[PDB]
Design an enzyme around this catalytic site. Structure first.
Site, mmCIF file in Angstrom:
data_model
loop_
_atom_site.group_PDB
_atom_site.id
_atom_site.type_symbol
_atom_site.label_atom_id
_atom_site.label_comp_id
_atom_site.label_asym_id
_atom_site.label_seq_id
_atom_site.Cartn_x
_atom_site.Cartn_y
_atom_site.Cartn_z
ATOM 1 N N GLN A 72 8.440 68.181 66.403
ATOM 2 C CA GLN A 72 7.312 67.334 66.953
ATOM 3 C C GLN A 72 7.560 66.303 67.769
ATOM 4 O O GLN A 72 7.411 65.967 68.662
ATOM 5 C CB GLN A 72 6.418 67.282 65.648
ATOM 6 C CG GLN A 72 4.994 66.524 65.989
ATOM 7 C CD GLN A 72 4.003 66.953 65.038
ATOM 8 O OE1 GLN A 72 4.200 67.553 64.035
ATOM 9 N NE2 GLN A 72 2.833 66.301 65.181
ATOM 10 N N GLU A 97 31.668 56.752 80.867
ATOM 11 C CA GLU A 97 32.138 55.550 80.779
ATOM 12 C C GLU A 97 31.353 54.657 79.653
ATOM 13 O O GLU A 97 31.891 53.656 79.372
ATOM 14 C CB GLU A 97 31.805 54.871 81.900
ATOM 15 C CG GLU A 97 32.053 55.514 83.385
ATOM 16 C CD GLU A 97 32.280 54.587 84.540
ATOM 17 O OE1 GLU A 97 33.064 55.141 85.464
ATOM 18 O OE2 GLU A 97 31.504 53.568 84.390
ATOM 19 N N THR A 121 6.047 59.146 56.043
ATOM 20 C CA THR A 121 5.148 60.320 56.076
ATOM 21 C C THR A 121 5.411 61.414 55.340
ATOM 22 O O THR A 121 4.793 62.581 55.559
ATOM 23 C CB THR A 121 4.933 60.345 57.640
ATOM 24 O OG1 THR A 121 6.119 60.522 58.365
ATOM 25 C CG2 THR A 121 4.262 59.341 58.218
ATOM 26 N N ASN A 147 10.638 54.451 63.062
ATOM 27 C CA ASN A 147 9.371 54.099 63.365
ATOM 28 C C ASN A 147 8.880 52.700 62.879
ATOM 29 O O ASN A 147 8.184 51.985 63.715
ATOM 30 C CB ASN A 147 8.491 55.103 62.660
ATOM 31 C CG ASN A 147 8.296 56.570 63.314
ATOM 32 O OD1 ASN A 147 7.886 56.687 64.379
ATOM 33 N ND2 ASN A 147 9.114 57.629 62.792
HETATM 34 N N1 LIG Z 1 8.043 57.445 67.070
HETATM 35 C C1 LIG Z 1 7.443 58.742 66.711
HETATM 36 N N2 LIG Z 1 7.631 59.490 65.338
HETATM 37 C C2 LIG Z 1 6.829 60.693 64.950
HETATM 38 C C3 LIG Z 1 6.054 61.129 66.062
HETATM 39 N N3 LIG Z 1 5.487 62.290 65.546
HETATM 40 C C4 LIG Z 1 5.966 62.469 64.183
HETATM 41 N N4 LIG Z 1 6.803 61.524 63.859
HETATM 42 C C5 LIG Z 1 7.478 61.152 62.740
HETATM 43 O O1 LIG Z 1 8.671 62.614 62.579
HETATM 44 C C6 LIG Z 1 8.472 62.804 61.409
HETATM 45 C C7 LIG Z 1 8.093 64.501 61.140
HETATM 46 O O2 LIG Z 1 9.042 65.020 61.841
HETATM 47 P P1 LIG Z 1 8.340 66.689 62.451
HETATM 48 O O3 LIG Z 1 8.906 66.579 63.846
HETATM 49 O O4 LIG Z 1 6.862 66.443 62.219
HETATM 50 O O5 LIG Z 1 9.176 67.797 61.521
HETATM 51 P P2 LIG Z 1 9.749 69.145 62.087
HETATM 52 O O6 LIG Z 1 11.092 68.803 62.646
HETATM 53 O O7 LIG Z 1 8.925 69.486 63.264
HETATM 54 O O8 LIG Z 1 9.638 70.419 60.870
HETATM 55 P P3 LIG Z 1 8.404 70.902 60.265
HETATM 56 O O9 LIG Z 1 7.500 69.823 60.068
HETATM 57 O O10 LIG Z 1 8.723 72.023 59.550
HETATM 58 O O11 LIG Z 1 7.881 71.408 61.637
HETATM 59 C C8 LIG Z 1 7.556 61.976 60.521
HETATM 60 O O12 LIG Z 1 8.167 61.092 59.726
HETATM 61 C C9 LIG Z 1 6.749 61.267 61.912
HETATM 62 O O13 LIG Z 1 6.381 59.972 61.235
HETATM 63 C C10 LIG Z 1 5.765 60.470 67.295
HETATM 64 O O14 LIG Z 1 5.046 60.920 68.066
HETATM 65 N N5 LIG Z 1 6.522 59.500 67.889
HETATM 66 MG MG LIG Z 2 7.457 69.183 61.937
#
Ligand SMILES: Nc1nc2c(ncn2[C@@H]2O[C@H](COP(=O)(O)OP(=O)(O)OP(=O)(O)O)[C@@H](O)[C@H]2O)c(=O)[nH]1
Ligand SMILES: [Mg+2]
Ligand SMILES: CC(=O)O[C@H]1C(=O)[C@@]2(C)[C@H]([C@H](OC(=O)c3ccccc3)[C@]3(O)C[C@H](OC(=O)[C@H](O)[C@@H](NC(=O)c4ccccc4)c4ccccc4)C(C)=C1C3(C)C)[C@]1(OC(C)=O)CO[C@@H]1C[C@@H]2O
Ligand SMILES: Nc1nc2c(ncn2[C@@H]2O[C@H](COP(=O)(O)OP(=O)(O)O)[C@@H](O)[C@H]2O)c(=O)[nH]1
Lengths: 290, 437, 187, 436, 62
Positions: free
Chosen positions: D11, D254, D179, D206
């Protein structure tokens, strides 16, 4: 393994006389002399007690601070101001609290009525059992559960007789024991539910002797793990961290943290090809010993 | 993908599914004719999670109503949103259950299981990627308790990899509407433990107390009770339906909440909740939502969190809001009231956010908490059960269906093993030395 | 430490039999326990350490960091019981070049992976009691192509029962070993 | 000729994918239609877009990226958002089921059936390249998809290329703000897996970006959309030397040789400066000297590590805008005389500087301001091992009672893989201490 | 190396002067390991290290 009959008296004497340790406070209500039959109380042992915490001692949740705080003090006329003025943990649950173990077992009642063919055999070099009849021809269905139900006892000579009864019947049992298993689960669970160290250390050694007494007892016991392991999960990590101090107490069996480990290894040993998962389901910390 | 099928068993479940489906149909903007009358394609992108498309551009729920005594089925057919159900998805018996778990699970169950299973399979084929099952019971009566447990046992072996919810209404600790209520509760909790994945528990007393204090209602009806239930049941699946910057699938909502396979009895509440008066003036902010949800009142069931410690908790917000606020509010609560949270979990709250607020609100939030205080309900239930079974009252009924008393004893023992689980984990510290001394 | 001492045929660092075996060892326990109990197979005392979370319950050979265990004997031999659990131990080594390698052996690992400062490797323990011998000078040559100089630290993690830890200076046979430096399992 | 492949997993991977590709298309004047306006050409040079794009047979520019995920609910948004004409639908990948915050599902159960799909895309996506600098992996360590798949991909990439360079801009679990509840596990499980397969791994958090948003930008309502704009600002500054002129060019090769001393120490910090709003931007000169001070400021770090508890093994400075090489030389020399900034004895050197004549771009409706000077710093500090110790504690805290383990072992994993990964952290910790 | 005692050398006072005394036979040693070590002691000035080192190389070269 080691017997449980002899160790108990010497242990109790070493604890109460030699050290300043306590019995501690074994309730003997309703039980008078050795002649008068006791009045069995209606209570049950290993019973979870209700929460006794007051009404008001419960803190209230302040919508403004996001905290449980205790209520303020109502005024009182005696505590009035005078001339000079210049100026929440939750109630813990009895997880490790020894439940109340009343003497209202069934073994005591049967022995009082005198229906048991047992007696103490002082003519031996120590305390032994003396049977009025032949053990290998008894009705296990009627007697064996009665003897297990006396393990929870603490008053002499009931607990000695009960432990020695099961210890001697399991040796000569053989095949006569397997069909009795469904009737042994309730007293075993009730003895474990008492949280008392003496009865727990006794019943764990008896449980080892039980799985070893015959063959095919392991698989037959496996379905009943969900009712006997829940207590194992508590005292699995009650051990002594002595470091360099050699454990002289190892002479007798008192440490639950490993009396449970040996018994779980034995269960996995005898249960077959599926006992490990039924164990791991109840006690999650367990590790396969094969 | 991510399809979901719904069941409503027993009178209570068949009645509350009415409100649930009314609220979902309103959310997605469809007429009790089944015709969509919304505005955005956001009501149609993920509509297939709850509905089936029909000819003539109509939408029919993926629900199965199962209930003896078809008076309730005729009631739900007469109700306003009744015309949307497939009449094929209506399984009733002509006889009654008389509030008897034994005949609900043994005699009259086995006669309707074949039909309900054919129906569930006919419509589980229709799914591209079935996410899971969800069901609504009532642990007090016979039909719900028995047939829900029987269907759960069937579903668990037919679809083990899938996941199952249960929005069960539990017995009441002070009200005894029925007299065989504890029997019916225990004989069903024994089945729930092994064949459910998530089990929300709801209680009429806390429902009444919420509606009376917070909502200031003068005469609460089962209508408003089911309104609350449906609000929560809908807020569950916002991440599957609508987009969200931090989505929360139903499966990652169980993985992050149940640490051990047996502790799946949750505890929920809804936010915001207020009367028409203070609606005009209360600003709607993440702080307000998170200070109302963490109260010990919004818990829809009758278990005070003050008596235990939160194993895990979860908060699903919906509405365009700042996620830093949510994150830090949860963190600050954990920091402030640190004693009411176990130590062997560093951070024990999950926070999920969806972009789409409710239809009539700008922001809302649903709460779930797997607190160790839930053990008191099972303690009370077992106390009542063993005060009554000790005398063997009302047992000739349950024996008449071929049952015996080892089943009662087994159920009671399993309840006590589960309350012991809860008690142990309520005070096991991260360092072992403090427990055994 | 152990500098300017005499190591010619053997060097015993730990022995369960004694007034205080953990003289030089530091012990750290988090969810475990250390004690000395009488084993059944080898009917004598063995110092046992157990507990969950293997990576946290261990004992380091030098009492404190910043103090090295200068020992130049090639072979290192331990006498351990196999409890069928997760057991691992680590030994830090100084090469001919001033670089401190470290090798560790784990029973819950299945692949060896050489790294600049670490070399993890599996260990195929037998059942019950067994002595394990490390060349500890072939290992450095086989991993980094360098020469062994002297051990610096030794560390043994949880779920094991120790009886003997000793450097050997060569692979002695069951005959050449003295009575104390061997496994005499009675009946 | 100088091309890279940008992979976004999970995500947060594709969330910042919405930020980077918003920026690049805006940097090169590409409108979301993938075309150029063809009437107001602003690009002072031609064939600079080829670093990130692939001109079709006639007019259109398609980004050479790959959005990968198991959740459809986000990948479909891209298919509906304005940036749908950009991507070839073959690039947007999605699955019917989610890993659901579980390393095993992202690694063992689900991922192994679509890697062949993604890998075939990458083959087709690398064959059109003539000189491939290296991949650019965006990950979110803490989820099932980001950790489970991201680990599973990098192995498949290493066995295929190996000689190719791989970078990872993995966001990392914050100390305080979290989160999730099970992120200690899959984080540990991820590191042990990426380590032998990534060549460089930038790390950012974050929570630290929330404060940079608080103190400097003075925003009271930060959201993931606000943070992802910053990551785009970094990589635009980082890859400028790939697709822009300027003295002291810096390629990826580099860049990785003179910043990884030992084959495993590659977790590097980050910092950007200046970061201000519009009104402050124009009452100011933004001297090269005052910028490089805010870069080495501890508050301006994008991770919750205090570098003043350790020493700097190296520092890379990508300057951007109107900068003369004399001022870098005169300002870097200022900090070496500073006392708070420590450097391990074994590096009397420690600075790889880079200058670009192409000033940073601003997104209309963003939060940053337009400037003529900007400094993005990447440093490899030995204090970074402290944030690697928090997980060594939290993982050990819950792994005692073995909470949530029945999931991982239930989805094709064994308990061995837990303590296996645990060693590699404790082994890594002392590696951060041996260099002291 | 001499401190750790790994060398097969010793001083031979029984001779009419300072001589070397080998614990083993010189012509079968490993020159690759020992000869550089002996050259590296030439720089020494403290007795008896420098005497031993010079005499070591002097006898091994023959
Ligand atoms: N800086 C930033 N952090 C994000 C964002 N969206 C989610 N996060 C963080 O990413 C973490 C969750 O990772 P995910 O990508 O939702 O989990 P995943 O790898 O897709 O695996 P699944 O949840 O099973 O789909 C959390 O701690 C979020 O705070 C964003 O848009 N920007
Ligand atoms: Mg996820
Ligand atoms: C004019 C206006 O907007 O007024 C509000 C309103 O004042 C309040 C008081 C509403 C109102 O709710 C009640 O008065 C109420 C009565 C009994 C039991 C429960 C609620 C409202 O009915 C509720 C209604 O909520 C919705 O419309 C939501 O979308 C909600 N919808 C339904 O429950 C629903 C009911 C029947 C038919 C179709 C939908 C919802 C909630 C969760 C998930 C999906 C939808 C709204 C905002 C209002 C009124 C009309 C006054 C409240 O309810 C909700 C769920 O928002 C009660 O406290 C909240 C706060 C609201 O601000
Ligand atoms: N929230 C809500 N609860 C109800 C409703 N109707 C009944 N209940 C409760 O459901 C319980 C009766 O169980 P019931 O389902 O009728 O018996 P069963 O059909 O054998 O399962 C009682 O405790 C009722 O109070 C309703 O309409 N809404």
């Amino acid at each position: 393994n080691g017997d449980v009959a002899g160790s108990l008296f010497t242990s109790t004497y070493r604890n109460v006389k030699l050290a300043g340790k306590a019995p501690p406070a074994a309730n003997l209500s309703g039980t008078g002399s050795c002649f008068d039959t006791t009045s069995l109380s209606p209570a049950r042992a290993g019973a979870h007690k209700a929460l006794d915490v007051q009404k008001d001692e419960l803190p209230v949740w302040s919508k403004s601070t996001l905290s449980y705080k205790y209520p303020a003090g109502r005024p009182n006329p005696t505590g009035f101001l005078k001339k000079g003025d210049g100026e929440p943990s939750p109630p813990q649950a009895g997880a490790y609290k020894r439940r109340e173990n009343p003497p209202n077992t069934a073994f005591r009642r049967f022995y009082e009525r005198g229906d048991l063919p047992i007696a103490v055999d002082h003519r031996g070099s120590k305390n032994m059992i003396a049977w009025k009849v032949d053990i290998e021809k008894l009705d296990y269905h009627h007697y064996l559960p009665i003897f297990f139900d006396g393990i929870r006892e603490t008053q002499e000579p009931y607990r000695f007789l009960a432990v020695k009864g099961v210890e001697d019947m399991l040796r000569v049992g053989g095949s006569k024991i397997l069909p009795v298993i469904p009737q042994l689960i309730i007293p075993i669970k009730t003895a474990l539910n008492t949280r008392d160290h003496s009865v727990m250390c006794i019943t764990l050694q008896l449980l080892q002797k039980l799985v070893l007494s015959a063959d095919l007892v392991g698989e037959a016991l496996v379905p009943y793990y969900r009712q006997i392991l829940p207590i194992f999960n508590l005292y699995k990590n009650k051990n002594k961290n002595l470091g360099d101090g050699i454990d002289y107490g190892q002479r007798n069996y008192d440490c639950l943290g490993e009396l449970i480990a040996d018994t779980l290894a034995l269960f996995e040993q005898k249960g077959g090809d599926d006992a490990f998962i039924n164990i791991k389901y109840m006690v999650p910390t367990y590790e396969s010993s094969v | 993908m991510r399809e979901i099928v719904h069941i409503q068993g027993g009178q209570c479940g068949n009645q509350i599914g009415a409100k649930f489906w009314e609220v979902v149909s309103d959310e997605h903007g469809i007429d009790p004719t089944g015709t969509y009358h919304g505005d955005s394609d956001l009501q149609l992108e993920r509509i297939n999670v709850y509905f089936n498309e029909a000819t003539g551009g109509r939408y029919v729920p993926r629900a199965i109503l199962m209930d003896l005594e078809p008076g309730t089925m005729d009631s739900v057919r007469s109700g306003p949103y009744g015309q949307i159900f497939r009449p094929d998805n209506f399984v009733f018996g002509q006889t009654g259950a008389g509030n008897n778990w034994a005949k609900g699970h043994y005699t009259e169950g086995a006669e309707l299981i074949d039909s309900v299973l054919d129906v569930v399979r006919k419509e589980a084929e229709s799914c591209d990627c079935l996410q899971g099952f969800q069901v609504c019971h009532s642990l007090g009566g016979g039909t719900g308790s028995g047939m829900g447990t029987l269907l759960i046992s069937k579903i668990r072996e037919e679809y083990p990899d899938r996941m199952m919810l249960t929005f069960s209404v539990v017995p009441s600790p002070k009200v005894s509407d029925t007299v065989v209520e504890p029997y019916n509760a225990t004989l069903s909790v024994h089945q729930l433990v092994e064949n459910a994945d998530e089990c929300m528990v709801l209680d009429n007393e806390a429902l009444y107390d919420i509606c009376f204090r917070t909502l200031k209602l003068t005469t609460p009806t089962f209508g408003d009770l089911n309104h609350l239930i449906s609000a929560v049941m809908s807020g569950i699946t916002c991440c599957l339906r609508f987009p969200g910057q931090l989505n929360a699938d139903l499966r990652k909502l169980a993985v992050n909440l149940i640490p051990f396979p047996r502790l799946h009895f949750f505890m929920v509440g809804f936010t915001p909740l207020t009367s028409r008066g203070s609606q005009q003036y209360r600003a709607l902010t993440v702080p307000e939502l998170t200070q109302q949800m963490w109260d010990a009142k919004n818990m829809m069931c009758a278990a005070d969190p003050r008596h235990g410690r939160y194993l895990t908790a979860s908060a699903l917000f919906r509405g365009r809001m700042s996620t830093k606020e949510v994150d830090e509010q949860m963190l600050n609560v954990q920091n402030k009231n640190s004693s009411y949270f176990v130590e062997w979990i560093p951070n024990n709250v999950k926070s999920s956010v969806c972009d789409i607020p409710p239809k009539g609100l700008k922001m809302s939030a649903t709460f779930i908490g797997n607190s160790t205080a839930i053990q008191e309900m099972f303690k009370r239930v077992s106390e009542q059960f063993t005060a009554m079974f000790r005398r063997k009252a009302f047992l000739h009924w349950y024996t008449g269906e071929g049952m015996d008393e080892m089943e009662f004893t087994e159920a009671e023992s399993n309840m006590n093993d589960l309350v012991s689980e809860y008690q142990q984990y309520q005070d096991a510290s991260a360092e072992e030395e403090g427990e055994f001394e | 430490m152990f500098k300017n001492a005499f190591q010619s045929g053997f060097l015993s660092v730990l022995y369960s039999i004694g007034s205080k075996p953990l003289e030089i060892w530091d012990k750290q326990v988090s969810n475990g326990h250390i004690k000395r109990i009488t084993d059944a197979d080898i009917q004598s005392s063995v110092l046992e350490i157990m507990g969950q979370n293997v990576s946290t319950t261990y004992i380091t050979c030098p009492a404190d960091p910043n103090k090295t265990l200068g020992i130049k004997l090639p072979f290192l031999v331990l006498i351990i019981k196999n409890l069928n659990k997760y057991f691992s131990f680590e030994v830090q080594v100084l090469d001919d070049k001033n670089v401190r390698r470290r090798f560790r052996a784990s029973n819950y690992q299945s692949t060896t992976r050489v790294k600049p400062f670490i070399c993890t490797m599996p260990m195929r323990l037998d059942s019950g009691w067994n002595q394990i011998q490390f060349n500890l000078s072939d290992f450095t040559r086989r991993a980094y192509g360098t020469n062994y100089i002297e051990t610096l630290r030794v560390q043994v993690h949880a779920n094991c029962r120790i009886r003997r830890i000793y450097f050997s200076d060569r692979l002695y046979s069951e005959e050449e070993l003295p009575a104390e430096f061997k496994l005499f399992l009675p009946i | 000729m100088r091309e890279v492949i940008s992979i976004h997993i999970g995500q947060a991977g594709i969330q910042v994918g919405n930020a980077c590709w918003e920026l690049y298309c805006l940097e090169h004047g590409i409108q979301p239609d993938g075309q150029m306006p063809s009437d107001k050409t602003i690009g002072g040079g031609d064939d600079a877009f080829n670093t990130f794009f692939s001109e079709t047979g006639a007019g259109k520019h398609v980004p050479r990226c790959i959005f990968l995920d198991l959740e459809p609910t986000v990948v479909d948004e891209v298919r509906t958002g304005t940036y749908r004409q950009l991507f070839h639908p073959e690039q947007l990948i999605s699955g019917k089921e989610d890993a659901a915050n579980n390393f095993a599902r992202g690694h063992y159960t689900i991922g192994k059936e679509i890697v062949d799909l993604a890998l075939d895309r990458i083959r087709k996506l690398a064959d059109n390249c003539t000189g491939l600098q290296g991949f650019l992996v965006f990950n979110a360590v803490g989820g099932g998809t980001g950790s489970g798949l991201g680990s599973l991909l990098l192995e498949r990439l290493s066995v295929d290329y190996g000689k190719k360079s791989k970078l990872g801009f993995t966001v990392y679990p914050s100390p305080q703000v979290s989160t999730a509840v099970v992120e200690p596990y899959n984080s540990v499980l991820s590191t042990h897996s990426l380590l032998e397969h990534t060549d460089v791994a930038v790390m950012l958090d974050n929570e630290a970006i929330y404060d940079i948003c608080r103190r400097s930008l003075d925003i009271e309502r930060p959201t993931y959309t606000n943070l992802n704009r910053l990551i785009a600002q970094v990589i635009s500054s980082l890859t400028a030397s790939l697709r822009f002129d300027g003295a002291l060019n810096v390629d990826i090769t580099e860049f990785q040789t003179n910043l990884v001393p030992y084959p495993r120490i590659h977790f590097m910090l980050s910092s950007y400066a200046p970061i201000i709003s519009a009104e402050k931007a124009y009452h100011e000169q933004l001297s090269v000297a005052e910028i490089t001070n805010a870069a080495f400021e501890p508050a301006s770090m994008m991770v919750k590590c205090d570098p003043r508890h350790g020493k700097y093994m190296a520092c890379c400075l990508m300057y951007r805008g109107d900068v003369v090489p004399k001022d870098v030389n005169a300002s870097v020399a200022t900090i070496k005389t500073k006392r708070t900034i420590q450097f391990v004895d074994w590096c009397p050197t420690g600075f790889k500087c880079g200058i670009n004549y192409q000033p940073p771009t601003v997104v209309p409706g963003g939060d940053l301001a337009k400037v003529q000077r900007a400094v993005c710093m990447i440093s490899n500090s030995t204090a970074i091992g402290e944030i690697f110790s928090r997980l060594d504690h939290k993982f050990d805290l819950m792994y005692a009672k073995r909470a949530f383990v029945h999931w991982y072992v239930g989805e094709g994993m064994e308990e061995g893989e837990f303590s296996e990964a645990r060693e590699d952290l404790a082994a890594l910790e002392k590696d951060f201490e041996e260099v002291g």
